[PDB]
Ligand SMILES: c1ccc2ncncc2c1
C-alpha cells in the first residue's frame with residue numbers, strides 16, 4: 061500500500077521469538093518436566109520500540125533479518141497485531157530466524173537463558189541500499205554490526221545532503237551492548253542512546269559521569285542520552301547543559317523487560333513531534349515508568 | 362488389517378542444541394535450533410513409517426498454525442491422520458527441549474495445555490478392522506482401560522488368525538497408570554518408572570513387575586546404554602546389549618524409537634529376542650543422529 065512520504069519512523073535491528081517458561085525448580089539434566097506457564101513473545105530491541113511507537117500513534121516500520129518459515133510467521137503476525145509495517149524486512153536464504161528459550165525459576169526469580177544461535181546474517185549495507193528512504197522522517201539504529209551500519213548511516217547522511225531542512229531525515233543510534241565494535245556509532249546520529257550497562261562497563265558510575273565522559277565522542281550538534289532506571293534520565297546537547305528527569309516509578313514493579321526500549325521509543329516519538337529535549341526526557345521517563353508496572357506493552361497507552 | 366495404530370500425544374518440540382547443559386542463572390548461546398513433531402505416539406508413528414509399516418495416529422489436536430505444521434509433517438511421512446480428535450477448547454501442547462550435544466542428553470520442559478485427552482467415546486467410533494496392531498501410550502488410565510476392553514471384546518469374536526495385537530506404554534511414575542500393566546500382549550515400562558518403584562536394573566524391574574501383567578504377556582524394559590530386557594510366560598529373561606553410536610548427539614525420542622522398532626519386529630513374526638535386538642539396534646542408530654531421518 062501507499063505510504064505518504066516522510067511519514068514513518070523506521071527502526072533497524074533484531075527481532076526474536078522468545079519462549080518463556082515458569083518452573084517450580086530448575087530442571088535436572090536429562091529430565092522431563094511440566095512448566096507452570098509458558099509464553100511466546102516477540103522480542104528484540106528495535107522490535108520492542110516498534111511496538112511502542114505504534115501504541116503511541118506513530119506510523120512505523122521495522123527493518124531486520126528473518127528467514128521464511130514458521131518462526132517468521134508467528135513474528136510477522138505479532139508485528140502486525142501491533143500495527144507495525146514489515147514491508148522492509150530483509151528475508152534471508154541462510155540461517156535460523158532468531159528464537160530463544162527462558163526458564164524463570166518461580167522459587168527464586170532466577171532466569172536461565174538459551175540465547176538464539178548466530179546463523180542468520182544481519183542486515184547489510186547492500187540490503188539497506190535497496191531501500192527507498194523518502195518514506196521515512198526518522199531512522200533509528202540498534203547498534204549491532206557496526207561497520208555495515210556505518211555505511212547505512214553515511215548513506216542517510218548523503219541523502220540529507222540533497223534535501224531541504226524540512227525534508228531531512230532525523231537519525232538516532234543505540235549502543236546497548238558493551239562491545240568495542242559498537243563505540244564507533246557514537247559518531248553518528250542526531251541522537252545517541254547509551255545504556256546504563258554500557259556506561260558501567262566503561263566504568264562510569266552515574267548518568268552524569270557517563271554523559272560528561274562520552275560526549276566528546278558524538279558528532280557536532282548531537283544529543284547524548286542515558287537512562288539509569290530508578291535514577292531517572294539525563295541528556296546532554298551542544299550547549300553543554302546537563303538535563304535531567306527523575307524516574308516516575310509505578311505503585312509496584314511488575315515487569316521491567318523492554319522498559320529501556322520503551323524509553324528510547326518515547327524519547328524518539330516526543331522529539332519527532334517537535335518537543336524539546338527536556339520534554340522528551342520527561343515523557344520518556346513517564347512512559348517507561350508506566351510500562352514497569354504492567355505486564356507487556358498493553359496499557360502503556 | 363494392515364495398519365498399525367498408535368494412540369497418544371503429538372507435541373511441538375522446540376529444540377535447542379547446546380555445547381553443555383546451562384547452569385542455573387546463566388545465559389549461553391546455542392549452536393542450532395529446530396522445530397520437530399514430538400509426542401511419544403507421534404514419534405513411534407514416524408519410526409514405523411520409516412520402517413515401511415503403514416500406520417496411523419490417534420490423539421487430540423486443536424486447529425491452528427501449529428496443528429497445520431504438525432499435520433503437514435504426519436503426511437510427509439505418510440502417517441494416517443484420519444483418526445485424530447480435533448478440539449475447540451485448549452491449544453496444542455509444546456515444549457522446549459534442550460539437547461546437550463556433548464552427550465546427546467535431552468531435557469524437556471513441557472507446556473501441557475489443558476486440551477482434552479482422547480476418550481473412550483472417541484475410541485468406540487473406530488474401525489478396528491483395518492488394524493493389525495494397536496499401541497496405547499499411557500495417559501488417562503481410567504478411560505484407556507475402556508479402550509482396551511473394547512479391543513479384547515472385538516478379539517473374542519475373531520479367529521487366532523485375525524486378532525488385534527496390543528501394546529501398552531507406562532512411561533511416567535504415576536499411580537493412575539499402574540493399572541495399565543494388566544492389558545496388552547506387550548507391555549513397555551520405562552527405566553524411570555522402574556526406578557521410582559525401587560528397582561535398580563531391568564532384570565530386577567522385570568522379575569519384580571511380572572505379577573502385574575495379564576496372562577501370557579511380555580514385559581519389556583529398556584535401560585539406555587545398558588540395552589533392554591524382556592520377560593514372557595515361559596519365565597525366561599531375555600537380554601539385548603545396546604547398540605550405542607560412537608558419538609551420542611541426540612537421545613530425544615530414542616525410547617519411542619525403541620518401542621516402535623520392537624513392535625514392527627513383532628508384528629513381522631520375529632521372536633521376542635529378535636525384536637529386542639532390533640529395538641536396540643534402531644534406537645542406537647537414532648542416538649547418533651539429529652532427528653529421525655537416517656535411521657534406516
Ligand atoms: C526503567 C527500568 C527500571 C525502572 N524501575 C523503576 N522506575 C523506572 C524504571 C525505568
Ligand SMILES: c1ccc2ncncc2c1
Nearest residue numbers: 585586603605615644645
Ligand atoms: C536410549 C536408548 C538407546 C541408547 N543407545 C545408546 N546410548 C543411549 C541410549 C539411550
